[PDB]
Design a protein around this nucleic acid. Structure first.
Ligand SMILES: Nc1ncnc2c1ncn2[C@@H]1O[C@H](CSCC[C@H](N)C(=O)O)[C@@H](O)[C@H]1O
Ligand SMILES: [Ca+2]
Ligand SMILES: [Cl-]
Ligand SMILES: [Cl-]
Ligand SMILES: [Cl-]
Length: 259
DNA sequence: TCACAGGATCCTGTG
DNA sequence: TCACAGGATCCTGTG
């Protein structure tokens, strides 16, 4: 199921399997919502949270615009698969005006669609030799058809209030894989998230957590130990096949850990 | 005789 | 991107 935008680490292809394991709830809390692959596709009320304010503000803005507003901008900046100089201009405009619609248009044209915003709040992703495509308006339409049930927020995961009846879904930056958002992460942040999860458990609140125990030769030892206190679902089909067929090393063990 | 240039080391951020 | 210039500190040497 579609996410609002292309996004490193999105859960589009895994969502059906994940919904399999979800519990019932009064409110769905997507604590690290990212590209919104989870939030757009679960029953509301939904609280979509992400520490990257510019992206959250961009979603809040999308609610009131039409695909036509997007094309007008793309037209006025004469962007294309090869408009490197035009892309730099849009980038500067987004950086001094901070209008979220521009951030939305920029993301379609940058390096691997990455949205990188530095400390000063500027977008520094280089040109990606690309522009809108078949899925652009699709993800866009899917966002419009399902954003009603969402309340957006941009707080650090531990500063979000968790209410009884909340089903907390947690898909954070993973230490052992590669993403720009990994700059907001560390062994300490992870200890904090796992303690938070344990508390939710102490309070009888259901949670679900996405991660990887092994990737390319690296393993997350503390996460493996911690996962033994809960249910564990292995999701990478290839990883599971190879496990039964006993024949390979350095695979990606994608898991879903839950109480 | 304390101001300051430049070094060293670590780490951050960009193309 | 994943190299790698150059911040950020703290420190050492210089007149
Ligand atoms: N401390 C923190 N609190 C909340 N969100 C955080 C965070 N640190 C990083 N993030 C956010 O963690 C997200 C991990 S990626 C999650 C992707 C999402 N499930 C999808 O389908 O697109 C990123 O979007 C990042 O901005
Ligand atoms: Ca370079
Ligand atoms: Cl003097
Ligand atoms: Cl490059
Ligand atoms: Cl002197």
């Amino acid at each position: 199921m579609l996410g609002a935008i292309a996004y490193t680490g999105n859960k589009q292809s895994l969502l059906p399997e994940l919904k399999s394991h979800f519990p019932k709830y009064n409110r769905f809390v997507d604590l690290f919502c990212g590209g919104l692959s989870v939030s757009l596709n679960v029953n509301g009320p939904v609280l979509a949270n992400d520490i990257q304010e510019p992206i959250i503000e961009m979603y809040k803005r999308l609610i009131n615009v039409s695909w036509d507003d997007v094309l007008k901008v793309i037209k006025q900046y004469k962007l294309s698969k090869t408009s490197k100089e035009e892309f730099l201009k849009l980038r500067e405009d987004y950086n001094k005006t901070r209008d979220p619609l521009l951030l939305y248009v920029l993301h379609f044209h940058g390096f691997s669609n990455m949205i990188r915003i530095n400390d000063k709040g500027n977008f520094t992703t280089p040109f990606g030799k690309r522009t809108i495509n078949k899925n652009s308006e699709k993800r866009f339409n899917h966002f419009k058809q399902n954003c009603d049930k969402i309340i957006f927020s941009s707080l650090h995961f531990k500063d979000v209030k968790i209410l009884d009846g909340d089903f907390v879904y947690v898909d954070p930056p993973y230490l052992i894989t590669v993403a720009d958002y990994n700059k907001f992460w560390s062994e300490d942040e992870e200890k904090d998230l796992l303690n938070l999860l344990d508390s939710l458990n102490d309070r009888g609140i259901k949670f679900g957590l996405s991660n990887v125990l092994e990737h390319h030769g690296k393993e997350n030892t503390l996460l493996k130990e911690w996962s033994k206190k809960y249910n564990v679902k292995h999701l990478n089909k290839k990883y599971v096949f190879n496990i039964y067929h006993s024949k390979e090393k350095n695979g990606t063990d994608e898991v879903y850990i839950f109480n």
